[PDB]
Structures are given as structure tokens and as C-alpha cells.
Design a protein around this ligand. Structure first.
Ligand SMILES: CC(C(=O)O)C(=O)O
Ligand SMILES: CC(C(=O)O)C(=O)O
Ligand SMILES: [Br-]
Ligand SMILES: [Br-]
Lengths: 245, 245
């Protein structure tokens, strides 16, 4: 599986500073068999795609589930493609848990974005109370099932595990804890989709990762890369791109 | 009060067709004492601002309540300004009732967007069940109070009344029904802010409006313009700009 490093800029950046960040990223030497994707704020998708070299792909941070309509504040896959982006992040923990997006809606978005030709970074993960109740597997398997039920072509999908229980809670996820969930997710794909899909699908880690911790995380056998948050805004992101080196 | 016509493109358009629409709008002769604002999808704010003549202002369709942060899929006022837009629509019925945005959040967004120098088109309106229960005034007064509690400078605000009870319900709002709510809102401003604010604040109508109905709606004494939905994508929008002519 090709190592996959996504940089989610979240709601950060202006043209001057994003241009600067893009210069640093363009200058990186992307190692062999490594796929890099950046997700700018929605107001800057087109801007970022124009400035980033095509060796780096661009993702929207979210989209809606139909191609046009009466949805003030939304964007559609068709608009993402028209701006030159080729991916979308769906189901991010902030959309689910700050903005209330349901599994049903996420599945509908996945189906539409994939049908329209985008790749999807599909995010899953259990919250604090779910972790404490012992239902990690039940939660992430149900989230992954909703995604899988809306996928026709698994070559267009990357799964991102976010340990929401260890983000803003006082809990720390260890590399062994991350690996344990990634292994369970891969086993779900084996039993519910196929062994081939399990073996080829990238499952990237969306918890805390820094230049100092990325090599150990990347060495976990079922961790196939990262969906990076805050470090994606800094030159340290290049070190994370090089986590397997 | 300067007549105010906003065109909310909602989740519609691609570069080719939005460029076409912008050509039609640029070619319109904006009548005296008329203020025109267009709200493109977020992926096209910068694009639209570059192509629209400055005689037309650009609004974002939504924003968040801090200037940067861990809010995948959001944009901030600072980004809107960096893209050359000078307004934001806040509290739109689709954000409240499709996407679950609370009054508390809307008030926080209003405060931040205004502090950052944007104008705000602040939307209010009662749903079907609220209309049927007889609580139109209670609902829209509470929504307007939350907005007003977050306004330091009323010259930067336009209020938009959306008859949500008459959008997608089978009910029709008559011009007299729209006028009745606008008068009540203006009276709320008089009693709770000041007479001066009541007399100077534009209260625009955000229900159904077409070229065939816009002159009658515009003639209502407390209707100061429109926040137009679907007709804003068509040449008919120019007729609505001319509703007072
Ligand atoms: C911020 C946190 C949550 O929304 O619960 C997260 O997992 O990103
Ligand atoms: C669509 C409708 C609602 O969301 O209830 C509206 O008022 O826009
Ligand atoms: Br811990
Ligand atoms: Br009716």
C-alpha cells in the first residue's frame, strides 16, 4: 500500500501565509511510493490548486450530497472538481461532533462524491464516552459499514481513523492503541468486503502526530499514513511526509 | 432607507455559468439609491469578486465565530475579507433548520463577523409549527434580540425576514403577511434599540419573489428589499433589482 499523507489545514490560513506554506511543500522531495494530499479552507481550494504543484493533490474539507440546490453555505463535488481538486474529506470528527453530521448524511455524501469522480478520505472514530463504554469496535465498524455501503470502487477511498476519545479529553492514544484499532478495521474489511479490499485499502491515522512521533506511528503495520491537523501548517509537515524514510 | 437587493446563489453554479451570470449582472444599470450584493458558493467567493464590478458587493453565505481554528469545513471573516468580500449572510434558514445552527451560535458569529469589519445580512424567521402556534412575534423577536445583542454598529447590519413557514410547506405568504411581520420587527427595533435604528435599518424580505411579484412586495412600507434565492441565478434578478422603478 502506497503511504498516504494528508494535510488538513482546517480553518487556518490567508493567501499570503498559504502561499508561503505551498512554497515549502512544493520544494519538498516527495519520496517514492508516497501520496500527498492537502485540504485547504473552502475559500482557497482554487487558489491552493493553482499554486501547488500537481505532485500534490488538493482535497476539499467537506461537501454536500447533491450536485446543486438550496443549501446556503454548502459546496458540491462538481464545484470541487471545477476548482481542480480531486479529493474530499468526509466524516471528519469536527463535522460529526461539532457540527452534528449524522452517519446517514455522511454515507449519502460518500456516495455522491465518489459517483462524481472524487477520491474520498472517509473519517471514522469513537468518542470519549464510547471508548470508556468499551464500544470502540461497535462504533467504528458501524461507521465503516455506512461508508462501505456507499462505495462502488475502493481504489477511490482512504479510511482515516481519528481517536476522538484522545483529542481534547486529557487522554493520550499510544501507537499501540492506534495500531490496535487499525488492525480491527482492516479485519472488518476482510470479513465484510473482501480480503483484497482489506489488503489494498490505506487506513491512515488521524490522531496527534508530530515530526518527533511520526516514524514510530508509521512503523505500525496497519498504519498506512496520516491525516495531519495542526502540523500540516508548518514545515514539520515535510518531516511527516518522510515518516517511512 | 436605501433599497437593498441580495442575490443568494446558494449551492449552485460552476465557473462557466457563474461567469455568464456575472456578465449579465455587470451589464445591469443599477438604479439610484439601490444596493446590490451577491452571495456565491464559498468555493467561488474570490472568483466572483474578481469578475463582478465593484458596483456589486460580494457576500459569503456563512462563516464561523473565531478567526482561525480546528473547524474542518468552515471559513472565517478574515478569509472572507482576504478574498475581497465585504458581507456575510448569517442565520439563513437553511443553516438553522437543515444544518442545526443555534441562536447562540448565530449571535457569536454576528459579533465576530462585525468586529472583523464585514457587513452582516442577518436572517430571522419562524417555522411552520411556530406560525401555527401563534408565536411568530415571540420567535422573530427573540432571534432579533440575539442579533441586536451582538451589534455595535447598526450601519453594518441588514435584517432579512424569511417566512420559513411558507417555504416548502404548502403555505403561501401574501405581501400583506410579509409586511405585517416587517412592521412588527421594525417596532421591536424602536422599542428595544432606538427609534433611529428602527428608521434606518433595512429589513429585506426573504420569501418567494419573482419578477412578476417584486414590485408589489417592494411597495410594502416596511419591506426594504429582498434576499433572493433561485431567481438570483437568472436574468430575472435584474428585474428584481428594479422593483422600485
Ligand atoms: C474536537 C473533537 C470532537 O469534536 O469531539 C475531535 O475529535 O476532533
Ligand atoms: C427549507 C426551509 C427549512 O429549512 O425549514 C427554509 O425555510 O429555507
Ligand atoms: Br491516557
Ligand atoms: Br396558505
Amino acid at each position: 500500500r502506497k503511504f498516504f499523507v494528508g494535510g488538513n489545514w482546517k480553518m487556518n490560513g490567508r493567501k499570503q501565509s498559504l502561499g508561503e506554506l505551498i512554497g515549502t511543500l512544493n520544494a519538498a522531495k516527495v519520496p517514492a511510493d508516497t501520496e500527498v494530499v492537502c485540504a485547504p479552507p473552502t475559500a482557497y481550494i482554487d487558489f491552493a490548486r493553482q499554486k501547488l504543484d500537481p505532485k500534490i493533490a488538493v482535497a476539499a474539507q467537506n461537501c454536500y450530497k447533491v450536485t446543486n440546490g438550496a443549501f446556503t453555505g454548502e459546496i458540491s463535488p462538481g464545484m470541487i472538481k471545477d476548482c481542480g481538486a480531486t479529493w474530499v474529506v468526509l466524516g471528519h470528527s469536527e463535522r460529526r461532533h461539532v457540527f452534528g453530521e449524522s452517519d446517514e448524511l455522511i454515507g449519502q455524501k460518500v456516495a455522491h462524491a465518489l459517483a462524481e469522480g472524487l477520491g474520498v478520505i472517509a473519517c471514522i472514530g469513537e468518542k470519549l464516552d464510547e471508548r470508556e463504554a468499551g464500544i470502540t469496535e461497535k462504533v467504528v465498524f458501524e461507521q465503516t459499514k455506512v461508508i462501505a455501503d456507499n462505495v462502488k470502487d475502493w481504489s477511490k477511498v482512504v479510511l482515516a481513523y481519528e481517536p476522538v476519545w484522545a483529542i481534547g479529553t486529557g487522554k493520550t492514544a499510544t501507537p499501540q492503541q492506534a495500531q490496535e484499532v487499525h488492525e480491527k478495521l482492516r479485519g472488518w474489511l476482510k470479513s465484510n468486503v473482501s480480503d483484497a479490499v482489506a489488503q489494498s485499502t490505506r487506513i491512515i491515522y488521524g490522531g496527534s502526530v508530530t515530526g518527533a512521533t511520526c516514524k514510530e506511528l508509521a512503523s505500525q503495520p496497519d498504519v498506512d499514513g496520516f491525516l495531519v491537523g495542526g502540523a500540516s501548517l508548518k514545515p514539520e509537515f515535510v518531516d511527516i511526509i518522510n515518516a517511512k524514510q
